[PDB]
Design an enzyme around this catalytic site. Structure first.
Site, short mmCIF file in Angstrom:
data_model
loop_
_atom_site.label_atom_id
_atom_site.label_comp_id
_atom_site.label_asym_id
_atom_site.label_seq_id
_atom_site.Cartn_x
_atom_site.Cartn_y
_atom_site.Cartn_z
N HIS A 1 -4.78 7.20 15.44
CA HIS A 1 -6.09 7.52 14.94
C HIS A 1 -6.12 8.81 14.16
O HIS A 1 -6.98 8.99 13.32
CB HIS A 1 -7.09 7.60 16.07
CG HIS A 1 -8.50 7.42 15.61
ND1 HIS A 1 -9.25 8.46 15.11
CD2 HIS A 1 -9.29 6.32 15.54
CE1 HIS A 1 -10.45 8.02 14.78
NE2 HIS A 1 -10.50 6.72 15.03
N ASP B 1 -8.78 -11.39 2.64
CA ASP B 1 -8.14 -12.59 2.14
C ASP B 1 -6.79 -12.20 1.53
O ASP B 1 -6.72 -11.42 0.57
CB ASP B 1 -9.04 -13.23 1.09
CG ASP B 1 -8.59 -14.59 0.68
OD1 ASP B 1 -7.38 -14.89 0.75
OD2 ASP B 1 -9.46 -15.38 0.26
#
Ligand SMILES: CC(C)(COP(=O)(O)OP(=O)(O)OC[C@H]1O[C@@H](n2cnc3c(N)ncnc32)[C@H](O)[C@@H]1OP(=O)(O)O)[C@@H](O)C(=O)NCCC(=O)NCCSC(=O)CC(=O)O
Ligand SMILES: CC(C)(COP(=O)(O)OP(=O)(O)OC[C@H]1O[C@@H](n2cnc3c(N)ncnc32)[C@H](O)[C@@H]1OP(=O)(O)O)[C@@H](O)C(=O)NCCC(=O)NCCSC(=O)CC(=O)O
EC number: 2.3.1.-
Lengths: 452, 452
Positions: free
Chosen positions: B164, B393
């Site tokens: 993180h 995608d």
């Protein structure tokens, strides 16, 4: 702790000597049913002295007076031993009601709460109800017993135990009501409303199809099924009341309308039960459980038949006039999203079906043939919104809490239903469950309504 | 089952050689935080051969290309060993991303369901992430690792593990998105939208109050707190997605309006979280539990600070810009009837408070001083409606299922939140719970909405 048993409380001077009543086909089935137990709590600043001074004598009177009207309740239901036939309710000059006055150091304020309370502690305030005696070729069984119980400084409870074969629910409540009236106005019968005076002569229960016989001279072969003794086993479950509110009912009805806008039969009762039904079903999943989501699920309830073509039966007719309605569905869909809508559909059309249907009562009495249900997988409703036993003012005012103690013994989930004490249109739901189930359920009930 | 590890996946030819980034005060805290794990599943009729033939080379390319933009992700976060100061993110020509292509015989269709699924099986599809190496007076830690996993005939998963401190959530998602774009259009950079190109130069993170120093040269003394190694422990909990629906959100907002008709801050997010929050709290009671109904209860979430006076930070700025908001209340009232209304009040005003509040970020940086919360009694939200990682995608179409695997490790309840795959305004809620809790909760969620 016991104060005084009135092994006897005979009916008042002016009473008839003979009353024997043969059982309608309405009465027969209740012979194989356990006994009914209700308690009424009354909040009072009452001392022991004046409980003995006043409450006892005054109750003792007003009661006998009452029984001169509701006579069979001192009687005994006769049960045939050989295949001769006809069970009767019998009363003879002499037999009487057993009442017990007791005193108790248990927390009253606790008991009358709506919060879940250890189910086992309510058996202390409901009488135990005598063992069968003998007559020739027959055996007699007490039909009613009363316990009146002082809570030094907090109130009085009044417990009742009774055989369903005699009573009705409608019939028993009329009786308490009437006893209350009779005490309240110090036995002035001019206060006893027409409605609270029982109507006796049977045969107005017309029976062309000989079902009183049929539905009996066949049960007549399984007497071990008809336990004549009152044997109580208090279980460890938990008992709590739930208040669904005038408004909230409205909101529910509203919801139905919008979604499934057909349906004539969407009454308070049917939304209420439909709601509870889905919470039961839904709350079970919550408690880590192996459950057949594909198995069928039942809901049932008892009608009251007095509205019945001929002329509708006198609203004071004495025995039973209950008939059962049953709804059924797979758990899968009852637990899925349109569940409440479906609940209302089913419960509603269960009623809308066999309503003015007199034929199905008298003929096709396979009203007595609703025997493919899984008692274990079902939901049975006890009372009715109509029945206001909260109106039972004895002189000390209306009661603080009602408890239908015998919703415990059922083989799979039973719920009490009555009017609220308080706000005109609100309803009280009684339940008796395992502590973890109870927790589960109380959270489901309380969740759904808060989005309404 | 392992197919080929690319221990290396270096950035494309045209990349810079030097990139070292000192940590903002936004980055520091994440050093003591475990690593982030997300998976994306793609339903495909894909054979093994052409997974090796095509998917690998093509992904392998498109990735390196991506990293030439998102450079630190091949890097290593340097961690000072003596009290010299300044942790940096470091990248040097040579270091690279570890990716693994594996094949798997587990039921794909199972894994991508919304029904609760054994939490332990998702760790098979997220990379493990290398052990610390050494530099002089410093130690380096991999910042990112990828697992791409074939399910012969059903689809591909793509796992990510990352520190993180490097990423942001906003930053990591931009990166996946961009990698997808780059594969989808076979590495034609003319398709890479301005938004997906990271903005690096710090100092636009202005810091007058020397908090980057302060908020560190103090953490600098508890290095055992900053586990530099990625140590995974999969727990036995259960993970299921929940879909709250465009309509249902509307209905909730509607409910608030009516009841508490003040309140400006009633956004989808805040009803959603408020709803879940109350279901958590309410569903806990259901599972037979000893709970302090009087003890405090927390809700928390991370903002994104890029909208911040000065000029609002470039929406592509690289590091972290998260700040936490916390709400608090006694369980008693959160579990009682006006609970959801109160939930919305609290969560809403938690935000409506520290919004355009730049001072509280830069000064009063005791934004870093929200340390009186009971991690055990709290609810932390992971994602954001904004973040659409469903838009990723790669050429094989959008994904079938998203799983934020690292909502597991939290010390007390964490929930994922993203856009639905499907219907424009619906939202997905991710949860990870003990099977019985999970059951409890799924029933509460599903109950409340069905009355809406
Ligand atoms: C057979 C029953 C269960 C039927 O119950 P319901 O109350 O649903 O149906 P019902 O025909 O008695 O109508 C009940 C309510 O009061 C009367 C109706 O106007 C309806 O309005 P409302 O919606 O106000 O109740 C009976 O009420 C009973 O024995 N209990
Ligand atoms: C700080 C936040 C959590 C604030 O969340 P919210 O979405 O409630 O508040 P917001 O000001 O971002 O507004 C969110 C929604 O989209 C925008 C508003 O119009 C609102 O409408 P809508 O009701 O349609 O969401 C941030 O969105 C985030 O980091 N997450």
């Amino acid at each position: 702790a016991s104060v005084i048993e009135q092994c006897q409380v005979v009916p008042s001077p002016g009473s008839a000597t003979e009353l024997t009543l043969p059982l309608t086909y309405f009465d027969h089935v209740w012979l194989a049913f356990h006994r009914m137990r209700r308690i009424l709590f009354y909040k009072l600043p009452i001392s022991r002295p004046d409980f003995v001074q006043t409450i006892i004598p005054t109750l003792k009177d007003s009661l006998s007076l009452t029984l001169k009207y509701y006579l069979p309740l001192a009687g005994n239901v006769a049960c045939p031993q050989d295949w001769s036939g006809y069970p009767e309710l019998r009363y003879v000059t002499g037999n009487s009601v057993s009442v017990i006055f007791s005193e108790s150091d248990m927390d009253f304020n606790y008991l009358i709460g709506y919060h879940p309370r250890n189910t086992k502690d309510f058996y202390h305030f409901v009488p135990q109800l005598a063992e069968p005696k003998d007559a020739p070729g027959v055996q007699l069984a007490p039909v009613l017993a009363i316990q009146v119980t002082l809570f030094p400084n907090h109130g009085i409870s009044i417990g009742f135990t009774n055989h369903h074969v005699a009573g009705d629910g409608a019939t028993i409540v009329k009786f308490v009501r009437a006893w209350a009236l009779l005490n309240k106005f110090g036995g002035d019968e001019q206060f006893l409303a027409n409605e609270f005076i029982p109507f006796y002569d049977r045969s107005v229960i017309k029976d062309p199809n000989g079902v009183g016989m049929s539905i009996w001279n066949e049960m007549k072969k399984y007497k071990h099924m008809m336990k004549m003794s009152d044997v109580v086993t208090p279980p460890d479950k938990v008992r709590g009341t739930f208040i669904i509110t005038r408004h909230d009912i409205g909101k529910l009805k509203n919801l139905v309308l919008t979604r499934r806008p057909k349906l004539t039969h969407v009454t308070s009762f049917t939304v209420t039960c439909a709601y509870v039904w889905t919470c039961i079903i839904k709350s079970e999943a919550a408690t880590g459980e192996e459950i057949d989501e594909n198995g069928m699920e039942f809901f049932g309830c008892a009608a009251d038949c007095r509205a019945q073509f001929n002329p509708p039966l006198p609203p004071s007719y004495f025995g039973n006039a209950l008939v059962g309605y049953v709804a059924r569905t797979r758990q899968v869909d009852l637990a899925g999203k349109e569940g409440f809508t479906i609940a209302v559909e089913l419960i509603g059309e269960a009623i809308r079906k066999r309503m003015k249907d007199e034929e199905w009562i008298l003929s096709g009495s396979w009203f007595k043939e609703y025997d493919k249900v899984d008692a274990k997988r079902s939901l049975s409703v006890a009372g009715s919104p109509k029945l206001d036993l909260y109106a039972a003012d004895f002189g000390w005012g209306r009661p603080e809490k009602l408890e239908f103690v015998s919703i415990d013994n059922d083989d799979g989930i039973s719920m009490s239903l009555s009017k609220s004490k308080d706000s005109d249109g609100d309803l009280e739901i009684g339940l008796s469950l395992s502590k973890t189930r109870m927790n589960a359920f109380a959270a489901m009930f309380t969740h759904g309504i808060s989005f309404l």
